[PDB]
Write a protein that binds this ligand. Structure first.
Ligand SMILES: c1coc(CNc2ncnc3nc[nH]c23)c1
Ligand SMILES: c1coc(CNc2ncnc3nc[nH]c23)c1
Ligand code: NA
Ligand code: NA
Lengths: 163, 163
């Protein structure tokens, strides 16, 4: 008669990094607050922690360079041993067409003999509503931005082992 | 004793386009509302006019793909005959360090025999305050984004003469 409906759209992308899983993970997750702006100087102005110690439940905030505003990451899972990290974004995420309830970003870095690692990236869009309409360019935009942050960090660390 | 101080920082960049000045201009300025999203499908979600007919005093608004918000362009000069266009952004423009009063974006497309044209891009940052501190990466970010919108449009039109 009157159902509750929700869509979960999952995009998955992978690539092989030359950098070891441990180093890429520590770069993004533990040293993000100082390395995101270094890696993405023309996009990330500032990366800071608003609440928490870095563990699950931490809230971080990225301010972007120029008139692109800013956004909070709500950290969900942090697993140093398996180089796995998950966080959600809750605000500023609607499409002109399709409201979303949240976007979940997840990566898992898996060592490959030789180092570095296979970077397994996932994004999940959660839709509110009776209805669903999501285009290829949007879905791809989210996962490409995400894998892009990770690539920029990897590249920065390769060029500055020191730090 | 107590002066009024203001800085105007101007960045200038140029490149040669294969596309003619007339076509690139008409693309960005006259057909922007439909071509910006086509040219930049992973960044510009929507480009619309909020007030005005397209002339000086028009207010347009770009909504960006993802959690990057949206921004209004206030159109200052429109010169089809000389393929020249100027607009200002007034909001969301501070650096963590340095408030700005506005950013002015200006281009002039000058035909080169052969077509297309030399794309002359300018950005001007106007600072409020007693004090001034602006880094290379920020300044470059603004002009690179700008010349980047123009390159994306040129590339789109080259690949789709039809339209
Ligand atoms: C939806 C479409 O494109 C995006 C990119 N935003 C984004 N990507 C990856 N990590 C993020 N952290 C905050 N916002 C983020 C979200
Ligand atoms: C300041 C630093 O980077 C920017 C890029 N924002 C921007 N560029 C070009 N045209 C625009 N129209 C609105 N926002 C625009 C502004
Ligand atoms: Na900003
Ligand atoms: Na958006």
């Amino acid at each position: 008669i009157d159902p509750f409906t929700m869509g979960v759209i999952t995009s998955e992308s992978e690539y092989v990094s030359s950098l070891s899983a441990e180093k890429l993970y520590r770069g993004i997750v533990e040293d993000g607050n100082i390395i995101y702006p270094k890696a993405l100087p023309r996009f990330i102005e500032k990366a800071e922690t608003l609440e928490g110690d870095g563990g699950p439940g931490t809230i971080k905030k990225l301010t972007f360079v120029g008139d692109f505003g800013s956004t909070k990451q709500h950290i969900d899972m942090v697993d140093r041993e398996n180089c796995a990290y998950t966080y959600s974004v809750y605000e500023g995420i609607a499409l002109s067409d399709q409201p979303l309830e949240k976007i979940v970003f997840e990566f898992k870095l898996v060592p490959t003999p030789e180092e570095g690692c296979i970077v397994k990236s996932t994004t999940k869009y959660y839709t509110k509503g009776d209805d669903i309409e999501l285009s290829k360019d949007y879905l791809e935009a989210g996962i490409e931005r995400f894998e892009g942050f990770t690539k920029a960090v990897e590249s920065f660390l390769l060029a500055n082992p020191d730090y």
